[PDB]
Design a protein around this ligand. Structure first.
Ligand code: CA
Length: 279
């Protein structure tokens, strides 16, 4: 399948070269997979989700996304227009308040929630969790992300936006999960992206168009925006039978575009997520 005039980031993950605007993908489109978006919530009534999104948990007085961030991330995973895996099921877990903040104890609770909750959902092709959030190093936060991965969920996490070594941020620094940095439309590392030996992969993160609250759309930037590209890609590849939750991060790195990014510090991987789709 081909979607013309796609957002650049979707075009980039199905291309060997920058500078194109069509997204090419298998029509299966992540059907039968599930992606948890652990964030500020998801505006499930947004037409772009077509009834495929629902809120399953909140730790606040409401399950609604009063911020936008979670809706944007969810859109990049699985909206009709802006999403990687256009037929995936999206589940929202609201661990961040409407200011975008959350205590680590709540975040941990949300990750353990997903490890259990997947047993209540029909996801025959596999389960992914997308975590566009982080803060200073915490062994307890890393441990929770490791447990979620161990339970059979592909965990994708944002590297962080401090232009620093991700070793000092959590859950970015947990080795067993898939830590995602950000690139721009000219194949440069995004100027804010964290880096370091703990990164596994890069995805599009600068000027990413996706869904927003109030039934709207907007373009924003961050490792938060790269992460759902990789989460969506994992769901898409799992549906195709190419990989599993345990091995999807390694499979994505193995099949990535290699050596095409600039401003990659020495010791950081030069790997850009790629779907390897040949029509
Ligand atoms: Ca890793």
């Amino acid at each position: 399948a081909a979607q013309t005039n796609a957002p650049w980031g979707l075009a980039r993950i199905s291309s060997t070269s920058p500078g194109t605007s069509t997204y090419y993908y298998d029509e299966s489109a992540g059907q039968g997979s599930c992606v948890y978006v652990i964030d500020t919530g998801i505006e499930a009534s947004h037409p772009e989700f077509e009834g495929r999104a629902q809120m399953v948990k909140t730790y606040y007085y409401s399950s609604r996304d009063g911020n936008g961030h979670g809706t944007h991330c969810a859109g990049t995973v699985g909206s009709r227009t802006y999403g990687v895996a256009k037929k995936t099921q999206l589940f929202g877990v609201k661990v961040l308040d409407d200011n975008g903040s959350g205590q680590y104890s709540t975040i941990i609770a949300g990750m353990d929630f997903v490890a259990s909750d997947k047993n209540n959902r029909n996801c025959p092709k596999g389960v992914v969790a997308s975590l566009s959030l982080g803060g200073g190093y915490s062994s307890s936060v890393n441990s929770a992300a490791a447990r979620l991965q161990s339970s059979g969920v592909m965990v994708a996490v944002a590297a962080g936006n401090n232009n620093a070594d991700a070793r000092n941020y959590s859950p970015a620094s947990e080795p067993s999960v898939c830590t995602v940095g950000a690139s721009d439309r000219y194949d440069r590392r995004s100027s804010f992206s964290n880096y370091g030996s703990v990164l596994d992969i890069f995805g599009p993160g600068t000027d990413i168009l996706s869904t927003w609250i109030g039934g709207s759309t907007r373009s924003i930037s961050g490792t938060s925006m790269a992460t759902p590209h990789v989460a969506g890609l994992a769901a898409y590849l799992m549906t195709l039978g190419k990989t599993t939750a345990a091995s999807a991060c390694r499979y994505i790195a193995d099949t990535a575009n290699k050596g095409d990014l600039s401003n990659i510090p020495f010791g950081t991987v030069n790997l850009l997520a790629y779907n390897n789709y040949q029509a």
